[PDB]
A and B are shown apart, each in its own frame.
Chain A
Amino acid sequence: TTYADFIASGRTGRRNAIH
């Protein structure tokens, strides 16, 4: 499911701005 793929991914925490 997309939710499972999201939860198993490395981008579920607070995300940093790029510059």
Chain B
Amino acid sequence: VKEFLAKAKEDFLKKWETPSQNTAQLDQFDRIKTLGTGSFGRVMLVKHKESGNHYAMKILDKQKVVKLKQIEHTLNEKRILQAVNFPFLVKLEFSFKDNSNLYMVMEYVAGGEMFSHLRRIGRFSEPHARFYAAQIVLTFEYLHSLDLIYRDLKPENLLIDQQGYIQVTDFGFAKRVKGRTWTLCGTPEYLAPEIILSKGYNKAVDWWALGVLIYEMAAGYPPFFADQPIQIYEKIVSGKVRFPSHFSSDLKDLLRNLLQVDLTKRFGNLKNGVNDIKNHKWFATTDWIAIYQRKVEAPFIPKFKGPGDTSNFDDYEEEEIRVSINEKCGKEFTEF
């Protein structure tokens, strides 16, 4: 594993130091349908004209990015995504910009969000939840070894591919950082206590969030929920967790060590690092190399309906892609 990560790091740093830029343009694609949405634009299923391949095009309105003060985070997202390479990370296939928008064109993952399947089915069995969890463990091992913090783990940001495996999307809050960092960002249910308490935090926030994800997958609801974000934060900070009746002893023990307020005690954050998690009883049946190699048979394979089927995705209202004749925010996004 040490030699694997060493070469991964040389590969990543070459791309981090000289990023890809301007690798397509809007009129190379025909827009088909919205696959998903957010505050600063949207994701569309598109067909690339010359190859016929389908992609998921994330379109960000530069003026909305500036309004929500996400300039630097959007530059982080794209610089990081163009540089990384791991089986469970979605690939950025192209990127470009025009007078109005920023574009990141990814491989289209037609199985939909884990969030959809999780809410519909209700909850995942422990073997089903552990198969997904193991991929996230290996993915955070890889990201953290590049000094990247992910910061937005949740079922909404996990897509299920045609093999039943996970692809992590949405690097909007990902950041390359060697020290402590301070931005209040993430999703409320998934925030580690040290984020809420404004004291500076590091990569162990991702391992707390893996705790929240595993709990939610296996319970069907998160460990801390309330109608408003402020009431969510009060519960996280008190830190008391209750477990469903059906949770295994092994699972509850893993969760008490991930959802641990005390940094000196939180798994993934000790001297043994990720191996405290890999070697936990809950993961005893996990063959870590076979998961990396995608040799493990997936517990659920979304119904496949041909290239460009969107039936594993919700419907969304459809709006014009406006491109001004005046360049917006040209300086701010120069490096994009």
Contact = CB atoms under 8 A, between A and B. Distances in A.
A9 B227 contact: yes
B240 interface: no
A15 B221 CA distance: 13
A19 B70 contact: yes
Contacts of A16: 38-39, 187
Contacts of A19: 68-70, 184-185
Contact of B185 (A3, A6, A14, A17): A17
Given A16-B39, A19-B68, A19-B69, A11 B225 contact: yes
Contacts of B184: 18-19
Nearest to B154: A15
B126 interface: no
A6 B189 CA distance: 13
Size class of the B contact interface (CB-based, 8 Å): 20 to 34
Mostly helix, strand, loop or mixed at chain B's interface?
loop
Nearest to A14: B156
Interface string B226-250: 1101000000000000101000000
A15 B227 contact: no
Contacts of B227: 9-11
Contacts of B39: 16
Contacts of B221: 2-3, 6
Interface residues of A, number: 13
A16 B68 CA distance: 13
Contacts of B172: 17
Contacts of A14: 113, 115, 156
A18 B225 contact: no
A9 B184 CA distance: 24
Contacts of B41: none
Contact of B156 (A2, A9, A10, A15): A15
A14 B100 CA distance: 27
A15 B219 CA distance: 17
B220 interface: yes
B220 A3 contact: yes
Contacts of A17: 38, 152, 172-173, 185-187
B189 A11 contact: yes
Nearest to A11: B225
Interface in B135-176: 152, 154, 156, 172-173
Give me the 9 closest cross-chain CB pairs, A-B, nearest first: A6-B221, A10-B227, A14-B156, A15-B187, A17-B187, A19-B68, A9-B227, A11-B225, A6-B225
Given A17-B152, A19-B185, 4 more contacts: A2-B221, A6-B225, A9-B225, A17-B172
Interface of B: 38-39, 68-70, 113, 115, 119, 152, 154, 156, 172-173, 184-189, 219-221, 225-227, 229, 242, 244
Interface of A: 2-3, 6, 9-12, 14-19
26 contacts: A2-B242, A3-B220, A6-B220, A6-B225, A9-B225, A9-B226, A9-B227, A10-B227, A11-B189, A11-B225, A11-B226, A12-B119, A15-B187, A16-B38, A16-B187, A17-B38, A17-B152, A17-B173, A17-B185, A17-B186, A17-B187, A18-B186, A18-B229, A19-B68, A19-B70, A19-B185
